[PDB]
């Protein structure tokens, strides 16, 4: 709604494209994320000039409260920096949260539980007056590089690591048809990763409502689908597009998979 | 909202793009659309699953009222077929408009008058009621190729077709600085060309109040900014950033400029 201020940068020239390895529109015409393709100077003044408030999701149970004073610590030198960010810790352990030293206009928020559920219907209420956009990530994670507001939009999921360059063939979607999460093998436009997805609080409350009632279906009639909530993500990402795609940029582990040449950052990895 | 049907197409491969020769998103993220960027299947789908209705408006005075029956011809022929068309002709002489046969699902307005006024201002509440994005364009053209869905954005400009392959200080932006269109030699994305932009009615109610405004500022200070309303347009949309760029297969002139072969398609041209 609100105008922008005088900018300088470098003019974008319609005739250089900055990058010409990689796919960075998909055939719905939504953003993929790569290095290269965004202007952060220019996002930062939009989100900004907006008051945004990001809510970062992360569930830390029994052995993985190990996790969190790194992650924690990573996502403060990294994770939309010189924003408004709500850390919500879900934990059984809430005298284990560590204590990490939070900069300004940031805060954390520890509830305990006893995820598609937790997201979906406990905090209904909360997450619509508290924030603007919903990230969920696993915990046994490390930022390395810049993740910002680049991502937000109103639905985003991330490319698995591992499928990028598969064929859809060798995507390990739900095959069984008795599952809700069934997807045939000649549909599917990519394998999204359920370590790393969000959007608008609203986006996130509709997909997690759907995912956790398919779910139950599935439950009913007998049968886990194969990637549990991954596989639900997926049928759901299929079927309502999301309108930015991460790349792998955002989700690697350079332990399993090293560094190609296609990567420029290394973002946010799987700890060691 | 709603759910996508099963559909089959082509997996997009994350490391083969398809267009290498041109870019594709402007650095803060939106589409520049070009062919073989989209595919107008999935498109076609979202938009018809949300019962789409465009405006098209257009203006045809005194001499202009000749090319109407040419431009809602091939309209017919090419823009937005299987969707709820609305036009509104604004006319000086409503006894001219052609007589010309609609597909179903379309319809035409005539308006008497004696242009950023009067879409901001006359036709404010209609607008609001009856159509869902409104796209303006001028009459003395013709569409040659598809013109569809994969345009409809909150906010859209078209790249001027004289200007795509320059640099900014070439642009032809008000360098005045006494005028509100004022650009200084260092700013701008793109030109954009005032013969074809739009939105939702909502984005575009606000760029033309806010040009229609700053135009009658420039007026009591007697000064008429050198591209009038085109001055004004560039100047809203280097501040506020469309949220999709079409390319110049969208407004060319093939007289002028023949068929450079960037452009696949040529889609809505001046006529001779």
């Given at each position: ?104 206009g940031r805060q954390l928020s520890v509830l305990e539980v006893g995820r598609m559920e937790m997201i979906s219907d406990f905090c209904e209420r909360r997450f619509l007056s508290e924030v603007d956009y919903l990230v ?137």
């Open positions: 709604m609100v105008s922008l201020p005088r900018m300088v940068y470098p003019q974008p020239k319609v005739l250089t494209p900055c990058r010409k390895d990689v796919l960075v529109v998909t055939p719905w015409l939504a953003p993929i994320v790569w290095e290269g393709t965004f202007n952060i100077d220019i996002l930062n003044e939009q989100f900004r000039l907006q008051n945004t408030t990001i809510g970062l999701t992360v569930f830390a149970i029994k052995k993985y409260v190990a996790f969190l004073k790194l992650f924690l610590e990573t996502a403060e030198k990294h994770f939309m920096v010189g924003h408004r960010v709500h850390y919500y810790v879900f934990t059984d352990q809430p005298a284990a949260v560590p204590r990490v030293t939070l900069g300004t969920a990530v696993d915990v046994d994670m490390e930022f390395r590089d810049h993740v910002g507001v680049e991502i937000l939009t109103p639905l985003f999921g991330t490319l698995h690591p591992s499928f990028y360059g598969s064929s859809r063939e060798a995507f390990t979607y739900e095959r069984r048809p008795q599952s809700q999460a069934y997807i045939p093998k000649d549909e599917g436009d990519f394998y999204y990763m359920g370590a790393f997805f969000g959007g608008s609080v609203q986006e996130v409350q509709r997909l997690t409502r759907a995912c956790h009632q398919a779910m139950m279906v599935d439950q009913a009639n007998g049968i886990e689908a194969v990637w549990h909530d991954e596989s639900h993500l997926n049928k759901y990402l299929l079927r309502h597009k999301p309108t930015k795609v991460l790349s792998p940029e955002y989700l690697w582990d350079q332990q399993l998979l090293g560094w190609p040449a296609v990567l420029r950052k290394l973002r946010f990895t799987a700890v060691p």
